[PDB]
């Protein structure tokens, strides 16, 4: 199912090793369907590789990065959505997992 009415948003992001960013996408798919999502640039990365969508709704994803002002083109069912975030540094100095 192709999708229309895309508009993204960032509630609160912190560039770190964890699930440090959250994003929210408004969308309107044509029908029920499983479909993929891909980070176009390399800085942002999406954990959840693909999801089911139904139609006019909004969807929450989790992402990692390194940059504060994350400018973001993202391909979903191929449609380019643009977004921008002003992230924050984390509080812990040293974590163990890479």
């Amino acid at each position: 199912p192709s999708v229309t009415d895309m508009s993204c948003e960032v509630p609160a992001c912190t560039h770190s090793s964890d699930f440090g960013g959250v994003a929210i996408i408004k969308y309107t798919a044509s029908k029920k369907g499983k479909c993929a999502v891909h980070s176009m640039t390399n800085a942002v990365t999406i954990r959840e590789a693909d999801v089911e969508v139904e139609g006019n709704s909004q969807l929450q994803i989790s992402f990692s990065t390194a940059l504060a002002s994350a400018e973001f083109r993202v391909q979903v069912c191929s449609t380019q959505v643009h977004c921008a975030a002003a992230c924050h540094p984390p509080k812990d100095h040293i974590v163990n997992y890479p």
Partner: protein, 49 residues
């Protein structure tokens, strides 16, 4: 399609590649290494006890 890609040798992290096949919906896929092993040459010289 056949698709070639290259990934870093970081064990235990998901890398994402995207199959952008035209005429088809794209397919993202994840690779994660569990182990990479190197077995060198088994050339014995002698023993010691």
């Amino acid at each position: 399609y056949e698709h070639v890609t290259v990934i870093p040798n970081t064990v235990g992290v998901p890398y994402k590649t995207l199959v952008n096949r035209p005429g088809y919906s794209p397919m993202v896929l994840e690779m994660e290494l569990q182990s990479v092993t190197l077995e060198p040459t088994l050339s014995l010289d002698y023993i010691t006890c």
